[PDB]
A = this chain, B = another copy of it.
Amino acid sequence: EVETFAFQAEIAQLMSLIINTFYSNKEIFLRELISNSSDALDKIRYESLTDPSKLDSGKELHINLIPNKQDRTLTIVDTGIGMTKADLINNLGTIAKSGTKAFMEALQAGADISMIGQFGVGFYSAYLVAEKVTVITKHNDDEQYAWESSAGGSFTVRTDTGEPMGRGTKVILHLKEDQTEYLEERRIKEIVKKHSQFIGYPITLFVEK
C-alpha cells in the first residue's frame, strides 16, 4: 500500500538548510504555495482552451485556505491541473536538483531564503513552518495520490483514500508548535494581502467554529 522513497541528496540538503537556518521571515511559505497553485490553475485553464472536457472534473478555478486549530493544520486547496504519481515522485513536478544547486550558489552570492521561488523549489519553503507536509493530488489522467514527508531524508506515496477531490492539489501543513500564528485569520489575511494580492483566481479564507 505505502511506498517509501529517498529524496535525492540535493533535495535532502535543501530541506535541511530550510529547517536548520535561522531565518525569521517564514511567512513567505504561503506566497510560494499560492504561486504553485496559480501555476497549476493556469495549466488546466490553458489545456481547457482547446479541450473543454478537461473541466468535466470541475469548472471552478480557485484556491481555498483552510486553517484548523484543533488539528494544527493549514491546508491550501486548489482545483488546478493536478500531478500524476510520476510527477509527485519526481519532486512534485519541479526541477529540484538543478534548482537546489542554483539556490545554494545564490545563497553564497548573498541571496536570502525568500528568493527560493526564483530557483523553482518554493514548495520546500513549507518546511519553514510545517513539521510534516501532506500533498494530495488528482490529475484527470490518473488516480488520487497522497505524498507525505516529515523530512529526514524520505517521503511516502500511496493511493489516497480520503475524500475525492475532483481535480487539483491539496497541501496540508502540519504546523510546528511555535508556528500557530499561521492559523489566525488576521495573520493569513495580512500575508495574502502583502504577497498574493494579484493572483488571478479567487482565494477564499475559510473560518472556523
A contacts, CB < 8 Å to B: 42, 45-46, 49-50, 86, 90, 93-95, 98-99, 102, 106, 111, 115, 118-120, 198, 200
A42-B96 Cα distance, complex, nearest whole Å: 10
A4-B182 Cα distance, complex, nearest whole Å: 52
Kindly name the residue among A94, A99, A111, A118 whose own CB sees the greatest number of chain B CB atoms within 10 A.
A118
Chain A binding site: helix, strand, loop or mixed by DSSP? Answer: helix
Partner of A45, one of B86, B98, B118: B98
Copies in the complex: 2
How far is the CB of A90 from the nearest CB of chain B, in Å?
Answer: 6
How far is the CB of A50 from the nearest CB of chain B, in Å?
Answer: 7
A119 touches B86 (CB 8 A): no
B111 touches A198 (CB 8 A): yes
Contacts of A49 in B (CB 8 A): 90, 95
A50-B89 Cα distance, complex, nearest whole Å: 11
Contacts of A111 in B (CB 8 A): 198
Counting from the closest, the 6 A-B pairs by CB-CB distance are A102-B200, A118-B198, A45-B95, A42-B95, A46-B95, A106-B198
B120 touches A50 (CB 8 A): no
A120 touches B200 (CB 8 A): yes
Contacts of A102 in B (CB 8 A): 198, 200
A200 touches B98 (CB 8 A): yes
How far is the CB of A33 from the nearest CB of chain B, in Å?
Answer: 17
B198 touches A46 (CB 8 A): no
